[PDB]
Amino acid sequence: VIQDTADVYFKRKSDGKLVFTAEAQTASFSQYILKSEKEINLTVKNAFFDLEWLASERYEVEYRTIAYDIYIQFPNVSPSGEFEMSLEEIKFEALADTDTDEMAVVIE
């Protein structure tokens, strides 16, 4: 059984360097040669950015929780930027490579 409070580490394919750490709140999966498009969306809170990394580009997501040891890996991702402003949260979407169209890795 899953406690449903997973944690997310956000890394980069160069050097395997961690970009930030967070926890996700919303995730959305939606829809001869059979063609089927699938789309993934992720939403995390205000993360913990790395000042070491302060010293396009391809990134990866790992998503860990406990079911009683369940790990999820998305190899290719893009952090699409949304600039807003208000008075007185980071969203991601998937990327599917054309070489080997795989999106989800599960380690149980």
């Binding site: 449903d4 919303t26 995730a27 999966f29 599960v106």
Partner: protein, 670 residues
């Protein structure tokens, strides 16, 4: 604003540009040995603050966050409806001014506003001396609120309430009104926080949000952004990890309810806060139904262990049953599926409903009906009794509830037919013991004793009568014959023929000699006599004289319609026996050509006579609502109307949300 105090209990540093003193407080809470490093008075103060925070439930930070299960606690007797207990608490002798404040709050909750106003004035009189500024502040707030209550009651009392009750009975005197309007002349409420002294501002800066005519407007918009979030979430259908926003909604709602009710503010009973909790728990239950109905394929099945569906709780039951309205119940009934929702702690619901029944028994036992308590109580009583159709209760409590609703309840507010609908909901929830059958029989005896007048009128909004009561009695037991009604029927004379008609509605629970006397005094004369005789099982086939009366009625109708063709009348009434005749022709119960000549009158009957020659464009598929299964099969036994009806039902089902018409297509057309 140095810390975010989010609603779960956890605290996050927001603007603390230095030492983490809240974290240091929780660090001192972690170790008793570090607590030994404090002073003795410091240890006492730390214990007092620990008791305060565990009283108010503030637990830890995000760095050490674990599992925070919710909990609902309300100690208010006013919320619990313990009216006798607070009556005795008012009858006690006052000890402190705080006890006087609770007494004035309970007097305002009972609705005795005059002594409530005078008691609040005396509280204000006392509170000057001891410098209890906060009690003075909420006393002034409640004084302006009860001034608003009195003025609103006076303005709506002299107008539509006279048409409501037929008499004024104005509760107050003009000198009381003159005293208050002298005391509250040109009175601002925004000044109140400014007028209090400076150290009161520096300590009670929290309490400024109470004093505004736009109270809870920020609460309303904080709800409304979350409602937008929930609407977007149910439209997309995502896997909400972490904690979903409905948890924040329910925690904010319970926090507001406990803060408002425990501190004894009169401002809980207002229309806007009722609307607030209305749409709040409506959104919560609609989200619960959506998460029940949702289907998943690949990752959510790997991710949804131990999904807590929303149950029914006693605090949730009272929060539903108090500040609701019946049209909103129909609104949530068109959506959702409340039968699939689990209920719990039903003994508490049973004792609450028992307290409600005893309260209305004591209220309507005598003629001392407090108009203020009546107006603040009956709508809550209606909401509680209408929500009572999904709770299973014991025999004796159901008997008390049924007897209280049938006898000690104003018929001027709830009609007989709506009472029948409500007890029908009670019977479909829980089965009917024979003592309760005797109770309903005595209720109908009271109805007949009302019916002994020759000038009496029986009024039903939905057109439901005591025949349906007796039909329900026969539906749960056919073998029961009401002997009280039998001897009443034996007591009938010739001049009692209106009462004879009312008992003629009540055929199957009578005796043989009484039925012989009734049939001696009965003659099938008008069309409603035919409707009753086919309704009570008296008439089963169609005699030719019934056909003669029907054709005579239709001839008179055609004469009147040819007259009315010059004028502008099209529709007549809901007494639409002519389409029933067309139904009987469609069921081949009448095979005369004279009614076949009567075609061209009304669209239903013209369809039912000649469906092959019927113009299908004028067909109204809402008629498809009011049909039964045998008629649907006979409808399926004709090619010509089905040729259009399949396409019409398809386009109605596809372009709308009629699940009943969806089942109508599904069960019979495929």
């Amino acid at each position: 604003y140095d810390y975010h105090f989010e609603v779960n209990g956890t605290v996050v540093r927001h603007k603390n540009k230095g030492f983490g003193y809240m974290e240091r407080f929780f660090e001192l809470k972690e170790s008793c040995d570090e607590r030994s490093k404090l002073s003795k008075k410091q240890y006492e103060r730390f214990n007092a603050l620990f008791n305060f925070f565990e009283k108010n439930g503030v637990i830890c930070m995000a760095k050490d966050a674990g599992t925070l299960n919710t909990s609902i606690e309300i100690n208010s007797l006013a919320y619990h409806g313990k009216y006798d207990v607070m009556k005795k608490f008012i009858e006690e002798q006052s000890v402190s001014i705080e006890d006087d404040y609770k007494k004035a709050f309970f007097l305002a909750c009972l609705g005795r506003w005059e002594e409530s106003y005078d008691l609040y004035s005396n509280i204000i009189l006392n509170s000057i001396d001891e410098s209890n500024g906060c009690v003075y502040y909420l006393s002034q707030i409640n004084r302006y609120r009860i001034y608003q209550s009195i003025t609103q009651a006076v303005t709506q009392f002299n107008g539509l309430g006279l048409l409501t009750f037929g008499r004024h009975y104005k509760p107050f005197t003009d000198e009381f009104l003159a005293r208050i309007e002298r005391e509250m002349t040109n009175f601002n409420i925004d000044d109140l926080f400014n007028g209090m002294p400076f150290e009161f501002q520096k300590k009670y800066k929290i309490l400024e949000f109470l004093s505004d005519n736009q109270f809870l407007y920020d609460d309303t918009v904080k709800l409304f952004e979350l409602t937008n979030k929930v609407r977007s979430e149910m439209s997309e259908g995502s896997y909400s990890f972490g904690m979903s926003s409905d948890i924040v909604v329910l925690l904010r709602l319970y926090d507001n309810l406990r803060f408002l009710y425990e501190n004894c503010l009169w401002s809980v009973s207002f229309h806007e806060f009722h609307q607030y909790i209305r749409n709040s728990m409506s959104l919560l239950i609609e989200k619960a139904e959506y998460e029940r109905t949702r289907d998943i394929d690949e990752l959510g099945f790997s991710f949804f262990g131990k999904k807590s569906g929303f149950f029914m709780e006693y605090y949730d039951f009272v929060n539903i049953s108090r500040h609701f309205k019946i049209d909103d119940i129909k609104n949530l009934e068109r959506s959702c599926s409340i039968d699939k929702i689990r209920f719990g702690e039903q003994e508490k619901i049973e004792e609450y409903l028992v307290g409600i029944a005893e309260e209305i028994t004591k209220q309507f036992s005598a003629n001392g009906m407090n108009v203020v308590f009546y107006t603040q109580f009956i709508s809550e009583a209606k909401a509680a009794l209408y929500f009572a159709k999904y709770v299973k209760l014991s025999e004796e409590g159901l008997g008390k509830i049924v007897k209280a609703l049938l006898f000690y309840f104003p018929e001027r507010d709830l009609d007989i037919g709506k009472r029948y609908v409500w007890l029908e909901r009670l019977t479909k929830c829980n089965e009917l013991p024979k003592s309760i059958i005797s109770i309903i029989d005595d209720f109908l005896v009271l109805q007949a004793e009302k019916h002994i007048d020759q000038n009496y009128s029986e009024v039903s909004s939905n057109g439901l009568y005591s025949r349906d009561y007796g039909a329900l009695i026969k539906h749960f037991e056919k073998n029961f014959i009401s002997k009280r009604l039998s001897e009443i029927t034996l007591c009938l004379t010739q001049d009692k023929q209106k009462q004879i008609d009312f008992l003629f509605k009540l055929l199957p629970l009578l005796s043989t000699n009484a039925k012989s006397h009734l049939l001696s005094f009965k003659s099938v004369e008008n069309i409603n006599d035919l409707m009753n005789g086919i309704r009570i099982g008296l008439i089963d086939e169609f005699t030719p004289e019934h056909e003669e009366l029907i054709i005579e009625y239709l001839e008179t109708r055609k004469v009147n319609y040819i007259v009315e063709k010059e004028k502008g009348i099209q529709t007549f009434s809901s007494n639409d026996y002519m389409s029933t005749f067309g139904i009987w022709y469609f069921l081949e119960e009448i095979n005369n050509s004279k009614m076949e000549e009567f075609i061209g009158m009304d669209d239903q009957y013209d369809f039912f006579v000649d469906p092959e020659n019927f113009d299908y464009k004028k067909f109204i598929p809402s008629w498809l609502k009011n049909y039964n299964d045998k008629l649907l099969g006979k409808i399926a036994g004709n090619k010509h109307m089905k040729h259009h009806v399949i396409e019409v039902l398809k386009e109605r089902v596809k372009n709308s949300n009629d699940k009943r018409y969806l089942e109508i297509l599904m069960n019979y057309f495929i």
